[PDB]
Design an enzyme around this catalytic site. Structure first.
Site, PDB file in Angstrom:
ATOM      1  N   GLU A  96       0.861  -1.361  -0.044  1.00 17.06           N
ATOM      2  CA  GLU A  96      -0.096   0.082  -0.005  1.00 17.06           C
ATOM      3  C   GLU A  96       0.869   1.210  -0.153  1.00 17.06           C
ATOM      4  OE1 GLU A  96      -3.161   0.185  -0.838  1.00 17.06           O
ATOM      5  OE2 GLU A  96      -4.076  -1.755  -0.285  1.00 17.06           O
ATOM      6  N   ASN A 142      -7.767   8.399  -6.368  1.00 19.40           N
ATOM      7  CA  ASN A 142      -8.452   7.328  -7.047  1.00 19.40           C
ATOM      8  C   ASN A 142      -9.208   7.873  -8.378  1.00 19.40           C
ATOM      9  OD1 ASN A 142      -7.687   5.102  -5.534  1.00 19.40           O
ATOM     10  ND2 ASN A 142      -9.130   6.241  -3.809  1.00 19.40           N
ATOM     11  N   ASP A 146     -12.212   8.208  -9.121  1.00 17.32           N
ATOM     12  CA  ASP A 146     -13.505   8.472  -8.787  1.00 17.32           C
ATOM     13  C   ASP A 146     -13.316   9.893  -7.996  1.00 17.32           C
ATOM     14  OD1 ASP A 146     -12.823   7.697  -6.059  1.00 17.32           O
ATOM     15  OD2 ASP A 146     -13.799   5.954  -6.089  1.00 17.32           O
ATOM     16  N   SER A 178     -11.819  10.211  -4.947  1.00 13.27           N
ATOM     17  CA  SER A 178     -11.623   9.922  -3.580  1.00 13.27           C
ATOM     18  C   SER A 178     -10.156   9.972  -3.456  1.00 13.27           C
ATOM     19  CB  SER A 178     -12.195   8.639  -2.924  1.00 13.27           C
ATOM     20  OG  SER A 178     -11.715   7.594  -3.765  1.00 13.27           O
ATOM     21  N   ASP A 210      -6.661   7.903  -1.295  1.00 15.33           N
ATOM     22  CA  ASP A 210      -5.976   6.905  -0.221  1.00 15.33           C
ATOM     23  C   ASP A 210      -4.871   7.565   0.777  1.00 15.33           C
ATOM     24  OD1 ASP A 210      -7.904   5.513  -1.509  1.00 15.33           O
ATOM     25  OD2 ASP A 210      -6.418   4.058  -2.222  1.00 15.33           O
ATOM     26  N   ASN A 242      -9.275   5.113   2.403  1.00 13.82           N
ATOM     27  CA  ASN A 242      -9.654   5.781   1.424  1.00 13.82           C
ATOM     28  C   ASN A 242     -11.038   7.104   1.896  1.00 13.82           C
ATOM     29  OD1 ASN A 242     -12.433   5.896  -0.396  1.00 13.82           O
ATOM     30  ND2 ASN A 242     -10.654   5.999  -1.729  1.00 13.82           N
ATOM     31  N   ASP A 247     -15.699  -4.630   8.499  1.00 13.00           N
ATOM     32  CA  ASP A 247     -16.800  -4.177   7.716  1.00 13.00           C
ATOM     33  C   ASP A 247     -17.724  -5.544   7.177  1.00 13.00           C
ATOM     34  OD1 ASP A 247     -18.206  -1.674   6.806  1.00 13.00           O
ATOM     35  OD2 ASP A 247     -17.477  -2.399   4.730  1.00 13.00           O
TER      36      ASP A 247
END
Length: 129
Positions: free
Chosen positions: A35, A46, A48, A50, A52, A59, A101
């Site tokens: 990562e 990202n 879209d 967003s 990280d 995110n 989650d």
């Protein structure tokens, strides 16, 4: 701050990640490796819109606020900034929420593609823990 491998394993362990939701320490170190290369100041945009943040590339779409991700949530209740500090507490606490989650560590696409099913114990080999 760029952590050493065994240095990150020790801080991860102290913050309660070792076997958290059944994921041994090596899984978390491996995921951090791919990562962020163990750099707390890693960020990545990202497609879209967003972003990280931090050692586990958490995110802004769901987990932290950066004031620039339209229609996102802040489920860890923190500024994304907090995920860049030398002190990994906020990244670890938020990772605990994510891994809980429902999808376990598959929430980290690099863990699924690069760590999952591998000899992850290799990443904590030789470390005083």
């Amino acid at each position: 701050k760029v952590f050493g491998r065994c240095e990150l394993a020790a801080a991860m362990k102290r913050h309660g990640l070792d076997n958290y939701r059944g994921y041994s320490l090596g899984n978390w170190v491996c995921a951090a490796k791919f990562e962020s290369n163990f750099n707390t100041q890693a960020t990545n945009r990202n497609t879209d819109g967003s972003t990280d943040y931090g050692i586990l590339q958490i995110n802004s779409r769901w987990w932290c606020n950066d004031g620039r991700t339209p229609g996102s949530r802040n489920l860890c209740n923190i500024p994304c900034s907090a995920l860049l500090s030398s002190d990994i507490t906020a990244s670890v606490n938020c990772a605990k929420k994510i891994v809980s989650d429902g999808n376990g560590m598959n929430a980290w696409v690099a863990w699924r593609n690069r760590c999952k099913g591998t000899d992850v114990q290799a990443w904590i080999r030789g470390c005083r823990l």
